[PDB]
Amino acid sequence: GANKTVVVTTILESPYVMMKKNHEMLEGNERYEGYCVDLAAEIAKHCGFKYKLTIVGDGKYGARDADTKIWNGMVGELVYGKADIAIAPLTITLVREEVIDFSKPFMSLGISIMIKKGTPIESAEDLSKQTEIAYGTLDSGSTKEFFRRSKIACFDKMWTYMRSAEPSVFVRTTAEGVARVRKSKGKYAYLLESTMNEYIEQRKPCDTMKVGGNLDSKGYGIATPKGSSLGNAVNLAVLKLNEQGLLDKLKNKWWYDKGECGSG
Amino acid sequence: GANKTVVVTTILESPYVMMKKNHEMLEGNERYEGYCVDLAAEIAKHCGFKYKLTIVGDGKYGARDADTKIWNGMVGELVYGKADIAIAPLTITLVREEVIDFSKPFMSLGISIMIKKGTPIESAEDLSKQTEIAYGTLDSGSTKEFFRRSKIACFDKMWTYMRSAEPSVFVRTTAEGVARVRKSKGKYAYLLESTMNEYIEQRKPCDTMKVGGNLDSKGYGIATPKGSSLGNAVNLAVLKLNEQGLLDKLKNKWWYDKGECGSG
Amino acid sequence: GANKTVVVTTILESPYVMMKKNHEMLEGNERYEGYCVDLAAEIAKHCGFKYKLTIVGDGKYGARDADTKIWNGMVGELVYGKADIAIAPLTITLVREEVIDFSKPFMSLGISIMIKKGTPIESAEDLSKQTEIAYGTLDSGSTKEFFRRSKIACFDKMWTYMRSAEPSVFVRTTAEGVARVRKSKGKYAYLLESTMNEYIEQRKPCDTMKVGGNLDSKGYGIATPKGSSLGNAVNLAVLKLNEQGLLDKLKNKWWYDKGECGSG
Amino acid sequence: GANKTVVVTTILESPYVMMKKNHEMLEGNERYEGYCVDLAAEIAKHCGFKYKLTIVGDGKYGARDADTKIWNGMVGELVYGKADIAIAPLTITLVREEVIDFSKPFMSLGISIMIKKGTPIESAEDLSKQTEIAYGTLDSGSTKEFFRRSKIACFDKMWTYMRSAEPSVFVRTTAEGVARVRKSKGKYAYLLESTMNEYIEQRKPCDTMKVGGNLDSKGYGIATPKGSSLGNAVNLAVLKLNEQGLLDKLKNKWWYDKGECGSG
Ligand SMILES: N[C@@H](Cn1cc(F)c(=O)[nH]c1=O)C(=O)O
Ligand SMILES: N[C@@H](Cn1cc(F)c(=O)[nH]c1=O)C(=O)O
Ligand SMILES: N[C@@H](Cn1cc(F)c(=O)[nH]c1=O)C(=O)O
Ligand SMILES: N[C@@H](Cn1cc(F)c(=O)[nH]c1=O)C(=O)O
Ligand code: NA
Ligand code: NA
Ligand code: NA
Ligand code: NA
């Protein structure tokens, strides 16, 4: 076909994609910064395309409604033909692989526990076995789906609590989960992807931390519509950028090099 | 096509695939045990196939000869049409993805440093900057290729040393690298995949250990010939087994649950 | 035939099927939780069907009226063609096997004695031989039928008392039997299935307990209309879920893991 | 069809079917005694048939050879058309239900641990975590198959040990397992069905006992060839005999009433 600008669906999620502080004065791709903004530029260079970053309209990662069977979020933008690629912290999952394609992972992660510092919790088993400290997840996305589907005893128990907890333990965005941890005086802990957890503990006011091991092991991938020819080049680009050390450099840049909570 | 037994290429590498102690009395797939033997059985169950485990004839993972352009090892078994699938600790790399297909990773790893306990080395930078302690890699495979291609300063320096070191610092198998570490009185350190390193430090005589962080981040995948229809089902099976927690259970079984070097 | 949503008849009985506390806000299968809700989801996954949980309209397990010969309850929903399957604590009995099909048991049980703690009763023989403490059963279902038909001396004696006792010793639901035990100051004991008894002694206020051995040994099965093709797949699914350990995990989840009356 | 004597396949296993002490002087069904001999007589009475008890020629319960796919044992007698019914302690399992029919259970059981008294083992986890005391199973049958197929962590670990243990930990008959426990001075424990374990601890010299809970929960059923019309009547007979209390009376007769190791 003719040359075409690639439509990239992505999501505002720190430090992957963020509005620049002066974004109102800026246009197009220049409005945004972060790990995935940098990654998109490198992928585009290696694959020889021009592109337009487009924040997903509904602010969602992607889930399939049980009733209507409609996908929302970034996954929906791909499935319904709006976007050519998703470059975001989009988790590779079985249900998604059935409907979209993913590159090999550009970053590893697992579900993890964020506490306000001093909360007496060390593990998922600890959380699951006490009744003083509430806990929840992002309200839509792979973390929620993981818990809803899991028959692993501890995680099934956690889901059975979370889905009925009152007031609701689910949040709309990571920033809301973090704020809830920070404001709840040790009485809320947040289950979130380790990559986000590990970012936030590097930010002021340095009052949150990861505790325990991860609950699972997975990866983020660059996604394309199922069968799109673009998937092959993008996958090879991810593998090249990984081997060359660029992914590690970008991770250090956006997570650690300017951390506000010390070193080591 | 007709029903067919799937030919699985694999490699003897502990604890992935090992001869059972009584293997001489046993036949077929029953001769073998380990993480990848267990994984193969689960993949086959989920994908509805019968299979035959076949140890790669040349004992190699897979590399492309610079002159003849011929692939050896497990990669060669796939490329030349001998095997239908590889179920092994086979690293997903760019050069390989161009010629075979890989599932999403079933295990994460990075290149790492093994020392005999007490060796005064803490990092790759340490190794690279001293001249008393020799170091090398497995003689063919992704670790060697990583170093040969790398322009990351420390790793380029290491390769430039290793490729000319005398006597040769390269070994034919992980077990030979481990034996060399154990017998060289602190004067040899071994660069190997973290998964193997972390296994060996759980085995008697408990005289080796991993030191430092990993040098890179990658994954092992289940490989199929390029464009084989079997790749789709096998990938979905890996994702399912991961989500269900089976991969983690197999890792704990073969690495840690019977560790001979303590707990914690 | 065409794809079809399976109609599942079931019954509100803790902890098998319960209304979620926020059920008024919820729709369809999401309204409900418990052991049989979890089991239904697993059976459906293994057998490849979609389903609709439907609480039996008359709140009954199933009995055949002596005069009209009409079946009520869940058994009636199956016999009269309203439901495709019953997934509930439905006891496998001879009279029922003549009119519906059952899977092999998914749970074992026997009739048992519940007392308010401190009641001086240790056995059925004890109950049968004194006249201070009244006792009864659920007013319709397999427990009542067991006593009505039994020629075992102790149980015949008990039935001969219960059927004429004034005020009536029969109750409409397990919760009513439990409340009667709790409110009757040791002057009522309740004969009920051991599985329910063992659940209730794990709940606050921890004032009831099982005493003695069970009076009989039987099982709950997944029921289908007689000769329905669905019975074969559902039976194989029950056997698979049993062997895999899932039934035991669900039992522990709903009976013991969150018990409110201590451990051990 | 014409009237016909039913061929019953069964197995010598105490106290289910045993040779009478004076069996050499006796003919036909009169040679044998035990729980299943008594049960066979009751089933035949209720179903209106004459029958011939026939001890399975190979002394096996039933397993399918991985290579030839041939069934041996009692299962084989049914599958290959030699016997009309199996009346024995034959465990209902998924793989068997695919090829033969089973009544609802006439007895419940689970895999369990037999020790020589004083052996410091309390649980499967204990057995699995030590290396001084060997343990095994009957060499063919549902117990062995359970361990071979299980992905439950503790049981997978146990299987991985047992299948390679030297000398072999497997035995040909329960009596051989019991003798090995008795003669091995606390250095062998035996994994066997709870019903057999509970029988043997009631026999002199009263030097063995069950320890711990059961590892699983299952049942024995009366088996018929798949689709045989005899299955319906036999199932209804089992349910009737259960409800009437006859199964419990037979269990007490053969296990406990003449126990040689005390009461209570
Ligand atoms: N990456 C997830 C979205 N997502 C993000 C998070 F920060 C988190 O904690 N959980 C989650 O599901 C997805 O792709 O759905
Ligand atoms: N996984 C590698 C082979 N392989 C194995 C090792 F144990 C190691 O240290 N290095 C390596 O290259 C490949 O696929 O080539
Ligand atoms: N399971 C029974 C119903 N049912 C329930 C009980 F909790 C009980 O104590 N008795 C009883 O008959 C049936 O299927 O009829
Ligand atoms: N009941 C089993 C046979 N069987 C008997 C035993 F006594 C025992 O311990 N294990 C076992 O498998 C079967 O049907 O295979
Ligand atoms: Na990290
Ligand atoms: Na690790
Ligand atoms: Na119990
Ligand atoms: Na018992």
Author numbering:
A (entry chain A), B (entry chain A), C (entry chain A), D (entry chain A): 1 to 264
Copy text verbatim from the article accompanying this structure deposition.
At synapses throughout the nervous system, activation of AMPARs (α-amino-3-hydroxy-5-methyl-4-isoxazolepropionate receptors) plays an essential role in complex thought, as well as processes such as learning, memory formation and brain development. AMPARs assemble of four subunits, each comprising a large extracellular amino-terminal domain (ATD) a ligand binding domain (LBD) that is connected to the ion channel forming transmembrane domain (TMD) and a carboxyl-terminal domain (CTD). Glutamate released from the presynaptic terminal binds to the LBD of postsynaptic AMPARs, causing rearrangements that result in ion-channel opening and transduction of electrical signals. The LBD has a bi-lobate fold, built up by an upper D1 and a lower D2 domain, with the ligand bound between the two lobes.
Here, we present the crystal structure of the soluble GluA2 LBD bound to the partial agonist 5-fluorowillardiine (FW) in a different tetrameric arrangement, which we could confirm with functional trapping in full-length receptors. In this arrangement, subunits B and D are found in close apposition, distinct from previously published structures. Screening across ∼200 conditions of mutants and different agonists, we obtained a crystal of the sLBD in complex with FW that diffracted to 1.23 Å resolution. The asymmetric unit harbours one molecule with density for residues Gly1 to Gly264 and a well-defined positive difference electron density for FW as seen from the ligand-free calculated omit-map. This allowed us to position the FW with occupancy of one and a B-factor of 7.0 (compared with a mean B-factor of protein atoms within 4 Å of 6.9) indicating that the site was saturated with ligand. Within the crystal packing each FW-bound sLBD (sLBD_FW) forms a back-to-back active dimer with a symmetry mate, which further builds up into a physiologically plausible tetramer. Intact D1 interfaces indicate that the structure is not related to desensitization. According to our sLBD_FW crystal structure, the parallel shift of the dimers allows subunits B and D to approach to a surprisingly close extent. Furthermore, we compared the extent of trapping from short (30 ms) to long time application (10 s) of Zn2+, obtaining a further reduction in the active fraction of only 10% after 3 s of application, indicating that the reaction was already practically saturated after short intervals. These striking results show that the sLBD_FW structure represents a unique arrangement of the LBDs, one that is available exclusively to partial agonists. Our crystal structure of the soluble LBD in complex with FW (sLBD_FW) shares similarities with the full-length structures, like an intact D1 interface and a stabilized interface between subunits A&B and C&D, which was confirmed by cross linking experiments.
